[PDB]
Chains A and B, each alone.
Chain A
Amino acid sequence: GPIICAGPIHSNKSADIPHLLGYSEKICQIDRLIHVSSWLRNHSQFQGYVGQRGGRSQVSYYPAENSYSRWSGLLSPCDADWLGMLVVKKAKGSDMIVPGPSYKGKVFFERPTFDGYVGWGCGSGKSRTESGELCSSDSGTSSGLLPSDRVLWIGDVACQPMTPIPEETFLELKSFSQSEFPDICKIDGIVFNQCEGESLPQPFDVAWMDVGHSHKIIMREHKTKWVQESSSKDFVCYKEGTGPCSESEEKTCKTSGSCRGDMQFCKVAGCEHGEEASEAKCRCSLVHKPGEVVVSYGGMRVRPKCYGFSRMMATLEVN
């Protein structure tokens, strides 16, 4: 289900996509896949929208049995991009498309890579071939009001506001990863260990975290703990049936203790209920997720920007 807003029923492909300043306003655009729509328009000159009727909850995932997608409040890379936390960059010819997903008919797909996040788009009237390598014309996409299953998010991924770590901690994490995967040479074309002879690039499923430096920390043995911290971004503010509150309304609810709220919002930021002369006022409620994830790895505890399990392309040592 959605964080705030049920799936869009757009009426035309030409409607503009406004920039919205409020957090809950942004969340509602995310619920409606307006951010992926905006990405496609910027980068592929796509016309219109993805997510018609279905919204974010009906996106396709690889693998399809996807743990974090069950929690509407966990952010995907595209979600985090819209919130300014990272950038899903337009794919270049050198970015490798992983085998496994069902690419045929897709209009957008995205995967984490070793050093970032990459998206592949299609222009108006086109969709992806079975291999994902090319866009071909597809009469099923002519309306420009496309369903959510045309959007493919690769990986079991959760993004979250990060607690930055110093370079010294990154370099010790990085050395621990190297010691855990001594046979890997490159990942997604990025040197991981020094090698001479190497395999061809191969699909590689791995746990990883993005800790905000030059590349991800990939992990074999690691521990995670989820704790609900009830920070201000863990709540959204809306009115029943009518969508997100404005930026200034949201700021009032999350600073003054004077708005309606669910129990956890009352418990943390304060709430006031009843009475009113007329019209329902703003309410804030807890976003549905396990909380904030802390990763134990190599003797360190880190609150990463993103954490996930997903497929990348790796070469292996040959000797």
Chain B
Amino acid sequence: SEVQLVQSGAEVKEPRESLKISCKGSGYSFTNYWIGWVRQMPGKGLEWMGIIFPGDSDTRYSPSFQGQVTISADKSINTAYLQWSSLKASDTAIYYCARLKRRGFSGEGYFDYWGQGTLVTVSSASTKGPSVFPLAPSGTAALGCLVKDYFPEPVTVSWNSGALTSGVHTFPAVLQSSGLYSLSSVVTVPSSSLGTQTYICNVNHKPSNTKVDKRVEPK
């Protein structure tokens, strides 16, 4: 047996809702190692949040998170926990648990095994299918589709029902301040095909069971 930390699945919550996420340790003596939690906000680095020693439930928090979160453990089921009484929009991030490995009396240990991470999304929005708008053109030309105001992730975008894949850029969704996602998908095409070739973007949003085919035409 090897050390494994398995975290719970992705969460979608509203602001001021409570949330408890979990990290189950296996392959080692659970009571004898600190477990830490690490936050990664979208497109940012790593921030240590706190640690718990499951043997006696002693906890230590970063000053940045002290009083903002609670870390707990249940040694009867080899699970550590991270929880919020009331979420804010700015808690949207990936949260990793990790096991601390201590060697001697000189330092504080390093994180030797990591969970796979739990995505937490905080928005006041409810499930909603996207509006699809043409990015009309405009050697080569560019055209595309603006996939706006959907929730939650993900949408899938194809062009001409998958016949067109090379030269496509589908950008990462951005979570807008409205709590809805937006993205664009663009493709490079010959100018001479503008008017003789049909370009259709197929947008599928499974959480809302919506499919939209949008023909993108010049002018």
Contact = CB atoms under 8 A, between A and B. Distances in A.
The answer to whether A and B touch in the complex, with CB atoms under 8 Å apart, is: yes
A9 B192 CA distance: 13
B166 A6 contact: yes
A67 interface: no
Given A142-B196, A143-B196, A143-B197, A9 B191 contact: no
B188 A143 contact: no
B218 to A, nearest CB: 16
A53 B160 CA distance: 13
Given A142-B196, A143-B196, A143-B197, A53 B166 contact: yes
Contacts, number: 29
A50 to B, nearest CB: 14
A147 B140 CA distance: 17
Interface in B179-213: 188, 190-193, 196-197
Contacts of B192: 11-12, 143
A143 B165 contact: no
A90 interface: no
Contacts of B190: 9-12, 143, 145
Interface residues of B, number: 14
B193 A143 contact: yes
Given A7-B166, A9-B188, A53-B165, 17 more contacts: A9-B140, A9-B166, A9-B167, A10-B190, A11-B139, A11-B190, A11-B192, A12-B190, A12-B192, A53-B164, A53-B167, A143-B190, A143-B193, A143-B196, A143-B197, A145-B193, A147-B163
A293 B193 CA distance: 44
Interface of A: 6-7, 9-12, 53-54, 142-143, 145, 147
Contacts of B188: 9
Please report whether the interface of chain A is mostly helix, strand, loop or mixed according to DSSP. Answer: loop
Interface in B62-97: none
A96 B95 CA distance: 65
25 contacts: A6-B166, A7-B166, A9-B140, A9-B166, A9-B167, A9-B190, A10-B190, A11-B139, A11-B140, A11-B190, A11-B191, A11-B192, A12-B190, A12-B192, A53-B164, A53-B165, A53-B166, A53-B167, A54-B166, A142-B196, A143-B190, A143-B192, A143-B197, A145-B190, A145-B193
Contacts of A7: 166
Contacts of B193: 143, 145
B139 to A, nearest CB: 5
Contacts of B140: 9, 11
User: Top 10 A-B pairs ranked by shortest CB distance?
Assistant: A53-B166, A11-B190, A11-B140, A9-B167, A7-B166, A11-B139, A143-B193, A12-B192, A9-B188, A145-B190
A263 B165 CA distance: 32
B154 to A, nearest CB: 24
Nearest to A144: B192
Nearest to B191: A11
A34 to B, nearest CB: 16
Interface string B150-174: 0000000000000111110000000
